[PDB]
Design a protein around this ligand. Structure first.
Ligand SMILES: C[C@@H]1CC[C@@]2(OC1)O[C@H]1[C@@H](O)[C@H]3[C@@H]4CC[C@H]5C[C@@H](O[C@@H]6O[C@H](CO)[C@H](O[C@@H]7O[C@H](CO)[C@@H](O)[C@H](O[C@@H]8OC[C@@H](O)[C@H](O)[C@H]8O)[C@H]7O[C@@H]7O[C@H](CO)[C@H](O)[C@H](O[C@@H]8O[C@H](CO)[C@@H](O)[C@H](O)[C@H]8O)[C@H]7O)[C@H](O)[C@H]6O)[C@H](O)C[C@]5(C)[C@H]4CC[C@]3(C)[C@H]1[C@@H]2C
Ligand SMILES: CC(C)CCC[C@@H](C)[C@H]1CC[C@H]2[C@@H]3CC=C4C[C@@H](O)CC[C@]4(C)[C@H]3CC[C@]12C
Ligand SMILES: CC(C)CCC[C@@H](C)[C@H]1CC[C@H]2[C@@H]3CC=C4C[C@@H](O)CC[C@]4(C)[C@H]3CC[C@]12C
Lengths: 390, 380, 199, 32, 388
């Protein structure tokens, strides 16, 4: 109504403080550099990656900051309660990294509904999605006992599919044929390049933070590094291939260059080998560019689901590919654990993402959170003081 | 007088080159050189350097036509301040042995000046900033040495007061200056700087902690307090604004609220809930300062000063739990504030001198005063 | 020594010392090594009384520096509003061009001198006169981000001289000194206003 | 203030060209 | 043909995959690697975003060139070190691959705005071959000390790019170009790359330094060289400009010359004051190069250098090599002086000759080179937004 956003945020913060007081108490310095790289990814990479919209940079980066800052606290609480089964627990560097991972999942989902939601809706979606994500990742890691060290399934596919389901519930007809504000600018694309480059550079730390120290962590770093390297080449090549007169598209360069990092995640600590990691990255970049070119218009115009950042083409399809790659590696016998449990983890991630997104989007649909009108979508001025000068 | 800037072609190069030659000579005469955690210890100082250069240089780049000067002048000030701080902490705390720890401490001394300069950026030229760097580093070193002599604390450990010293020094210097805005892309660059500052402020809250468990607890408290402060600052911005919208300028500084609130006591906070409470209270105080201080020049520097004072007060409250010590700590804080204000007065009176060729008050916040641009008429 | 001291007095605004030097016999048209006479220096530092006195003592109003800058160029770049008004009142050419093609309006526009820009526009300054690089006052104002100057330049357009001719202004105030200087420069006492009336 | 008379429109209004013209010879015919 | 670039990219990537399958097998230096990585992809990438209509090509072709470069450099340096046998991938392999990417990016800065992405792929492959062979010569045959790679990376890349740009000379661009001009926010974006390079250069110079005294010396010397370089670059930028105004080109580039010039002497016992002297001289030299030598190179020598990479990498790299020779003469290191001189000469000569042959290959009208009017324009290879 006016005070809904500050009231909900202060109530949530007081709840976080009470939960931390009731449940949270006080290897660290070895893993802290990797946590710093992950933190920079969460708050700079995603935040500035979503600033490609010419009239939504403020909301992109600021709502990214708000969502991730709330998400680290809420993910700490939920993941710790799940691990301790309801008892008081201590927190270390791993809890910090896992909470940042939960924030990353919420940010991936946010990329689907970017420019069409209010900050209040974003707080609600953060709170609900972290619960769904934490339950799914607990199932995958403890019941299925699958290997998802880079979280192609539990983070990327989950966030993509959960975001798409929220977008379909929130889909607006006036936006199907495009919007005048759903549109990029030169310097906005340069800021998006800041975000893309930081994500691309710090992805090896992202995929290797929770890996077992020694051979597995080094393997994850090397595999992510070379997978991203191959993915850049294939993303550039197919962006040239699919576009008019061979001109490169900044959407592809901003997003599809990270698909190799997304898709190598499940196999990151496995002995895929550098050539095997490179092959997955090349497939990832190809698939991401083709998704951006062909599947996104199909999803928007006929699917009725609008995905602003194209997070499907970066997180969902490369995530499914990463899960498929992990099942193939078990068939290879490079990695332990069963094929059936990897497939179960993939299916559970997708299904829980779609179900939780549908319920969360049904909650977000209510006309109480100050969501923008159709004409005011992708506009900072709905919630921010926008300077007259660009 | 002429609003056209006077030529600095003889003042600025001579000043900078003489400063660099003097620094090199002093380093030759007084500085001297000299494992397993070499990279780990280097990373803390690197994080301080990343904050000092990127976060502080870009945080003030939000001005419409003063982003170049903010970023580049911050870089120049950092480069001068670290060298001069190395020499000064060498002189007042003994030859000067140069280690990564000494570079880290000199970087902290430089960041004090870099924070203070935000209250005066857009109203001074490079030579005035050189004077401010030299005098402020000297004053901070003098304050630390005085506290070490009186209260028997370590000279390096007294650098904890640098938030409150920097805030009041900058406010005082800004008050002495002659009396006199945003754009979208500079606002996004300033958000980049603010994000880097917010992300690495736990490295500000524990460079001086030798013990590992103290560093761990302080880092955890800073991280959680900063998260709470970000949420409170973004949410409550709409309350403290006439148009009920979120102010990017307010967010850029109010994100750091919890970090400042727990800066001097994060090692003594035993549970994350208390640090989270302090971050929430810092965010609420930031809302109130944004809404109330303009009624009673830089408002963000004013609420920074209030938050540094609040951090000192919560240090006083916590230090009893872990009344003569209260009197000693209050005297320490009062001495710090008094020296900050007095040295700020002196710096402002020095900056008002004619020889600095300061920009005309009608030309504040404008890169054209200091920078070359094409298709301009030059000279007379 | 005498000419250099006269130029120093003109720079510092020491009208008494400059008048003493002129009484002694110093050439009023003397200039420094940069080609700046006393009028140029006084216009730079905003010394209105010195500018008026030097105009009354028959200084060449359109003398250019080594850069081609008239006194009006220097006053407009320095943002000296009163000096600009006084020089225009005594017949300064508002459309004069330096060697690089800069006009006083261009210098005022590039330096974000709004009042000078508006005064020059009301006095018939042509905003379409380009430099040797092809830049206009509007172009440099846009490049430097001077939004108020840009807005005023667009809104004015080509309306033209809306101030009276300087001789009409002098006749309105019964000012014989300014009229004498103007008629020394322009020998036509029947200058026409837009309404068709003589001074 | 004190400088409006330097502009052509204000000078035109001050000189009052209408005061040098024969305005009219009104009759105001009684019938209609 | 519009399919030249995607076909070349895919073929190069497939060759990379095959070579990795044939020759490659599987933590304290990882933060230093990440610092170097940030330098490679953000500092160099955004340092060339100063051109008003070439930011997309600068940052994107930086990413593409360095991504291909790390793989190809990994392969070439690994085969050189293993003498044709299989080799393992450590953190040092990744650091050295990023170094090869840095060399190619330095050369890219010379021909920025005048080349196609296809030309960039070809130049990446050829230049990495030449650079790796020269670096092997310096490290193993000469056994000279170049820990910061003033000679093997910076001077080599600068003079290689100068040779390429000389071969690719266009007579229509000697007097300047309308698109070859910076913008306000573009210079602001270039400051990002400048700041990141300045912040992380000590890790660049100390990543592969011997642990212990040498690595700490590299860090401290690089830091103080950069600190002095900033002050002297600002001072001389003011000195050489009308009325003492600061030039954003100088502030963006010459402030980094201390990192280049201290590289050879980084791990030597040259003391902080010696590193400061080196950085001060580097800032002076870089500003003077940008002010005076770059117009001389462009107009008279027909060598157009878009980013002025000569003034940042070549002249400061030569100064670094000379400083290494002098430091050896003063006993600051145990390496022979003649070997340092041989390393300097070999770096420059190999860079020049390889750049000539590479540019001769790039001069063939088969790679989609931009026309003279379309130089420094993103629109040749990118879909450009309609507003800024
Ligand atoms: C990858 C997964 C697949 C499954 C799924 O997620 C993504 O796909 C999504 C997409 O298919 C969604 C549908 C998209 C089309 C939607 C249409 C909408 O009705 C339309 O609502 C408009 C209001 O703007 C019109 O006006 C008018 O009122 C009416 O025409 C309906 O109310 C919900 C709706 C049917 C959505 C229900 C939920 C979904 C099925 C989502 C579902 C979870
Ligand atoms: C690396 C640099 C500093 C030194 C070596 C560069 C030399 C070999 C390069 C740079 C300048 C170049 C010349 C520049 C211009 C021309 C004119 C053109 O119509 C034919 C090629 C020709 C004649 C080039 C030949 C090669 C050249 C002489
Ligand atoms: C680049 C060419 C022109 C040479 C100029 C560089 C000069 C100024 C530099 C390069 C090598 C440097 C020396 C290298 C090593 C040492 C030994 C040390 O214990 C004292 C400083 C001293 C003696 C340095 C002084 C400065 C120095 C001589």
């Amino acid at each position: 109504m006016r005070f809904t956003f500050p009231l909900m945020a202060i109530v949530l913060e007081i709840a976080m403080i009470v939960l931390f007081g009731l449940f949270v108490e006080y290897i660290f310095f070895e893993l802290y550099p990797l946590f710093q790289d992950v933190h920079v990814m969460i708050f700079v990479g995603f935040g500035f990656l979503m600033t490609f919209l010419k009239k939504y940079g403020f909301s992109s980066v600021g709502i990214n900051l708000l969502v991730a800052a709330l998400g680290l606290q809420w993910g700490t609480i939920v993941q710790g309660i799940l691990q301790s089964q309801g008892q008081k627990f201590n927190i270390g560097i791993k809890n910090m990294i896992n909470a940042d991972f939960s924030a990353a999942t919420v940010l991936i989902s946010f990329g689907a509904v970017l420019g069409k939601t209010s900050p209040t809706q974003m707080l609600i979606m953060t709170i609900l999605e972290i619960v769904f994500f934490a339950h799914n990742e607990y199932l995958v890691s403890e019941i299925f006992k699958a290997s998802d060290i880079g979280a192609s399934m539990t983070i990327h596919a989950f966030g993509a599919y959960f975001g798409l389901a929220v977008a379909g519930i929130l889909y607006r007809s006036g936006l199907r044929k495009g919007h005048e504000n759903e549109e990029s600018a030169y310097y906005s694309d340069l800021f998006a390049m800041i975000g893309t480059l930081f994500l691309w550079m710090f992805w090896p730390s992202f995929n290797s933070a929770i890996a077992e120290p020694g051979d597995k962590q080094c393997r994850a770093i090397v595999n992510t590094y070379f997978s991203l390297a191959a993915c850049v080449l294939t993303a550039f090549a197919f962006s040239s291939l699919v576009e008019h007169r061979g001109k490169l598209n900044m959407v592809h360069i901003q997003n599809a260059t990270l698909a190799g990092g997304v898709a190598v995640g499940t196999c990151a600590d496995m002995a895929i080998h550098p050539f095997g990691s490179m092959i997955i990255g090349s497939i990832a970049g190809m698939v991401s560019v083709l998704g951006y070119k062909f599947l996104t218009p199909l999803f928007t115009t006929k699917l009725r689901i609008h995905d602003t950042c194209g997070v499907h083409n970066l997180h969902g399809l490369p995530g499914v590919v990463g899960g498929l790659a992990g099942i193939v590696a078990v068939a290879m016998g490079a990695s332990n654990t069963s094929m059936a449990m990897q497939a179960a983890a993939l299916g559970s991630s997708i299904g829980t993402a779609v179900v939780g997104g549908l319920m969360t989007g049904l909650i977000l649909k209510l006309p109480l959170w100050g969501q923008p009108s159709d004409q005011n979508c992708y506009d900072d001025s709905v919630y921010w003081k926008v300077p007259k000068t660009r | 007088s002429s609003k056209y800037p006077r030529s600095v072609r003889r003042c600025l190069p001579l000043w900078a080159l003489t400063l660099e030659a003097a620094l090199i000579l002093l380093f030759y005469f007084f500085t001297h050189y000299d494992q397993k955690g070499l990279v780990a210890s280097y990373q803390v100082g690197q994080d301080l350097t990343v904050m000092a250069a990127l976060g502080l240089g870009f945080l003030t780049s939000n001005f419409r036509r003063h982003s170049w000067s903010s970023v580049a002048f911050n870089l120049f000030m950092l480069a001068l301040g670290v060298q001069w701080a190395i020499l000064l902490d060498g002189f007042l705390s003994q030859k000067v042995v140069i280690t990564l720890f000494s570079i880290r401490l000199a970087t902290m001394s430089a960041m004090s000046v870099l924070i203070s300069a935000g209250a005066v950026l857009g109203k001074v030229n490079l030579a005035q900033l050189v004077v401010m760097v030299l005098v402020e580093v000297t004053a901070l070193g003098t304050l630390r040495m005085v506290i070490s002599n009186i209260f028997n604390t370590d000279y390096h450990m007294n650098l904890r007061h640098f938030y409150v010293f920097a805030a009041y020094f900058g406010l005082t210097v800004a008050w002495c200056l002659p009396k006199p805005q945003r754009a979208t892309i500079p606002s996004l660059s300033a958000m980049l700087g603010a994000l880097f500052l917010w992300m690495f402020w736990p490295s500000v809250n524990s460079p001086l902690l030798r013990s590992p468990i103290q560093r761990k607890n302080a880092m955890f408290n800073t991280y959680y307090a900063l998260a709470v402060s970000v949420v409170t600052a973004i949410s409550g911005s709409s309350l403290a604004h006439p148009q009920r919208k979120i102010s990017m300028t307010y967010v850029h500084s109010a994100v750091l609220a919890g970090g400042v609130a727990v800066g001097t006591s994060c090692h003594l906070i035993p549970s994350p809930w208390l640090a989270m409470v302090l971050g929430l209270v810092a965010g609420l105080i930031s809302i109130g300062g944004a809404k109330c201080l303009p009624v009673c020049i830089s408002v963000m520097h004013s609420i920074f000063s209030l938050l540094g004072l609040l951090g000192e007060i919560t240090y006083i409250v916590l230090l009893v739990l872990h009344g003569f010590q209260v009197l000693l700590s209050i005297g320490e804080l009062s001495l710090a504030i008094v020296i900050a204000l007095t040295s700020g007065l002196l710096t402002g009176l020095l900056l008002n001198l004619k020889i600095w060729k300061a920009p005309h008050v009608a030309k504040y916040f404008d890169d054209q005063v200091f920078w070359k641009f094409p298709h301009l008429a030059v000279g007379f | 020594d005498a000419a250099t001291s006269f130029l120093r007095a003109a720079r510092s605004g020491n009208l008494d010392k400059a008048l003493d030097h002129l009484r002694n016999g110093v050439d009023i048209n003397t200039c420094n090594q940069n080609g700046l006479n006393g009028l140029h220096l006084a216009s730079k530092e905003g010394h209105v009384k010195m500018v008026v006195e030097l105009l009354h003592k028959e200084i060449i109003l359109e003398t250019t520096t080594k850069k081609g800058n008239t006194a009006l160029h220097i006053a407009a770049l320095a943002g000296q509003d009163e000096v600009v008004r006084e020089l225009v009142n005594y017949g300064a050419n508002v459309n004069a061009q330096s060697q690089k093609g800069f006009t006083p309006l261009y210098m005022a526009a590039q330096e974000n001198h709004l009042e000078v820009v508006k005064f020059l526009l009301e006095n018939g300054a042509n905003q379409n006169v380009a430099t040797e690089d092809g830049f206009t006052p509007l172009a440099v104002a846009l490049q430097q981000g001077h939004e108020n100057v840009v807005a005023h330049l667009i809104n004015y357009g080509t309306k033209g001289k809306v101030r009276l001719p300087a001789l009409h202004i002098a006749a309105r105030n019964d000012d014989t000194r300014t009229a004498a200087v103007l008629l020394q420069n322009d020998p036509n006492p029947d200058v026409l206003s837009k309404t068709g009336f003589t001074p | 203030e004190e400088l409006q008379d330097d502009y052509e429109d204000m000078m035109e209004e001050n000189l009052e060209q209408e005061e040098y013209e024969d305005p009219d010879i009104p009759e105001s015919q009684m019938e209609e």
